[PDB]
């Protein structure tokens, strides 16, 4: 129940990331979902570009 992902190339070490989503009941989780969208974009960029 959270935006969950994991990268392993030939490093053999787990690069596991995940971010929480908006708990429903005060709104739809999709807002926290787009939040995690932006988050994962930032993460994949800042990790892979350098």
């Amino acid at each position: 129940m959270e935006l969950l992902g994991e990268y392993v190339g030939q490093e053999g070490k787990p690069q596991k990331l995940r971010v929480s989503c908006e708990a429903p009941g005060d709104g739809d989780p999709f807002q926290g979902l787009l939040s995690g969208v932006a988050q994962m974009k930032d993460m994949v960029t800042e990790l892979f570009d350098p």
Binding site: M1, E2, L3, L4, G5, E6, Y7, V8, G9, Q10, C21, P24, D28, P29, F30, L33, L34, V37, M40, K41, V44, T45, F48, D49
Partner: protein, 84 residues
């Protein structure tokens, strides 16, 4: 042999099947070294990408994830997923 697995949590299996399908059948402009593995598990969707060069890798990642984001904005503006 760069591998990248990711578990998107959805509310219902409806979004599981949808976001599995609506991005699978495209033989991507670049699968030359990229394998797209879309496995639905309940209401979660696991997706595993396989690549050999990180540039087109990142392009696939972010392009997909924004096709995702667009499925999301549609499930906010037309959805959330209807029972089918």
């Amino acid at each position: 042999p760069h591998i990248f697995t990711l578990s998107v949590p959805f509310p219902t299996p409806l979004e599981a099947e949808i976001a599995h399908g609506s991005l699978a059948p495209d033989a991507e402009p670049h699968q030359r070294v990229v394998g797209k593995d879309l496995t639905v598990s309940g209401r979660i969707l696991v997706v595993r990408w396989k690549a050999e060069d990180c540039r087109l890798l990142r392009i696939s990642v972010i392009n997909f994830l924004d096709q995702l984001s667009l499925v999301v904005r549609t499930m906010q503006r037309f959805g959330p997923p209807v029972s089918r």
